[PDB]
Write a structure and sequence with these properties.
The structure is cut from a larger assembly and holds two copies of chain A, nine copies of chain B and one copy of chain F (56 residues). Helices cover 0% and strands 0% of the residues of chain A. In chain B, 0% of the residues lie in helices and 31% in strands. Chain B is built from no helices and three strands. Chain B has a two-stranded antiparallel ribbon. Chain B is elongated, with a radius of gyration of 19 Å. With 56 residues, chain F is an alpha+beta fold. Classes of the chains: A little secondary structure (16), B mainly beta (49), F alpha+beta (56). At the B-C interface, loops of B face loops of C. Chains E, J: Belongs to the adenoviridae hexon protein family. Chains E, J: It is found in: Host nucleus; Virion.
């Protein structure tokens, strides 16, 4: 019982 | 570049096989009914055009 | 018929004019400017197209589909035997049996 | 044919499967100096391979 | 400190809602080299009344 | 490229006197694949200048 | 409204294969597909390692 | 180590396939 | 362009060698020490590119 | 170096960015019968300095 | 060990999608243009030594 | 039945992503903040009796 649910974008380093 | 590989002895002659990993590529153009024209490139370890 | 060849060493030779350093430096400075680029053209400036002619044939029709002919200089031509000429681009021609 | 040759002993021969290589590797000359392939138009002999 | 069920992430906001936006951007941008996603609870409450 | 396109070259049909379609100028072009950034920019400027004189 | 030229039994055997995996046996519906040993169907006569 | 290809997908429309402006 | 050569028959298979005369010119630039940049233009049949 | 790499598609734009948009539309619209996708390079550059 | 091959014939086969003649002509026109060149790497590319 | 074990040593191994020093410091500053506490369930949670 656990809840893995995430997604990502283009090859940037981190935040802007 | 130098590389030294240390390797177990074998009673028979053997080869080290290397791949220098590279971008080996082509681009292909077809501008009239009769014809095709290809540009090749290989970025490290080039061989011309 | 047994012929063979073996290269034991290839060395590169180069000869220099022992030019005065201030003059050679000045010449380089000028030859590195983009308006002073060197330029050359192949003496036989031509596209070397070869077309086959079967044995006993007497007519050789050829065509080019559509082309830009700007700066075209004209046609030059001659006939060769197939035996007497190698194919090239192939690093070796296993069918070039003449010498 | 002799009495002691009644006592001969046979062994089956070692098994040997022969056929073509996986995906026919080697049946066409890729990457070989004398035997490179061609693709070109009729009008121009300038090879795209 | 104060909320309880929503503090332990048993109910309420998603990791995409409670985390500061700087960290949400950083996660999305680095998620193929070093993925932070398994480190935050996402609640999943059942529908109750209808 | 989409901003410095190669020109389309119209063909002619002598029986009719009508234009037999067109295809790019695949037979007047300079190889730059062994030039550097300044030398390549002059190849582009020289093709931009051409595209202008054609539209003009 | 059934018809004499329909084949509901065969249609079901094909739909079960399109919906799931017939290689898994389910006793409730007596689901266990008719099969054969391929070594019996196509004899691979390698001889014997004797 | 280097497989790639054009892809920005759409399925069949209300027409389904083949007629290709919206 | 279409051409046609009428030639005497020979029992040997032969090749028509036709030279389309063009300009086959290069410009060579040397902006910094150790750098050679070349740009080529064969003017019709112009060229692989 | 860069126009060589942007022209042989080792760096820069995706096929969804360099191709004329008519071809990109045609590709998407016929991709289940006759798939043109495997005929164009997509570069995948790595993140460099940070 | 005595194995031998002979080749009696080679034929080339090719197969075409039967695409509608103005559609295929519309695709052809798009693919004959220098913005739309086809391009390919060696599908597990290296220089082999 | 005579079995026995002895431990000669225990060592702890840890591996770090070699992350750019200011990027890692930027990630740290975000994770020290109470909106961004990490949280976890027993992965197949129950009270066992």
């Amino acid at each position: 019982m656990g809840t893995w649910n995430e997604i990502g974008t283009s090859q940037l380093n981190g935040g802007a | 570049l130098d590389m030294t590989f240390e390797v177990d002895p074998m009673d028979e002659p053997t080869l080290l096989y290397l791949l220098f990993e590279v971008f080996d590529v082509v681009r292909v153009h077809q501008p009239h009914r009769g014809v095709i024209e290809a540009v090749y490139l290989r970025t490290p370890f080039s061989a011309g055009n | 018929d047994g012929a063979s060849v073996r290269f034991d060493s290839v060395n590169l030779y180069a000869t220099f004019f022992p030019m005065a350093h201030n003059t050679a430096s000045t010449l380089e400075a000028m030859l590195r400017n983009d308006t002073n680029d060197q330029s050359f053209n192949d003496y036989l400036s031509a596209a070397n197209m070869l077309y086959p002619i079967p044995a006993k044939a007497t007519n050789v029709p050829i065509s080019i589909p559509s082309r830009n002919w700007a700066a075209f200089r004209g046609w030059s031509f001659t006939r060769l035997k197939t035996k007497e000429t190698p194919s090239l681009g192939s690093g070796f021609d296993p069918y070039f049996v003449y010498s | 044919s002799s009495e002691t040759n009644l006592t001969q002993q046979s062994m089956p021969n070692r098994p040997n499967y022969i056929g073509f290589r996986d995906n026919f590797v080697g049946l066409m000359y890729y990457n070989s100096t004398g035997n490179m392939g061609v693709l070109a138009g009729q009008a121009s002999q300038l090879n795209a391979v | 400190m104060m909320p309880q069920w929503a503090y332990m992430h048993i109910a309420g906001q998603d990791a995409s809602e409670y985390l500061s936006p700087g960290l949400v951007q950083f996660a999305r941008a680095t998620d193929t080299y070093f993925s932070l996603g398994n480190k935050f609870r996402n609640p999943t409450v059942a529908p109750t009344h209808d | 490229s989409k901003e410095i396109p190669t020109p389309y070259m119209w063909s002619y049909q002598p029986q009719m006197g009508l234009a037999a379609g067109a295809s790019q100028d695949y037979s007047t072009r300079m190889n730059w694949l062994s030039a550097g950034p300044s030398m390549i920019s002059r190849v582009n400027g020289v093709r931009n200048h051409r595209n202008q004189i054609l539209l003009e | 409204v059934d018809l004499q030229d329909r084949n509901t039994e065969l249609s079901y055997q094909l739909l079960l294969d399109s919906l799931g995996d017939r290689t898994r046996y389910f006793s409730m519906w007596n689901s266990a597909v008719d099969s054969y040993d391929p070594d019996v169907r196509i004899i691979e006569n390698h001889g014997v390692e004797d | 180590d280097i497989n790639f290809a054009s892809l920005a997908p759409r399925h069949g429309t209300r027409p389904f396939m083949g007629t290709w402006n919206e």
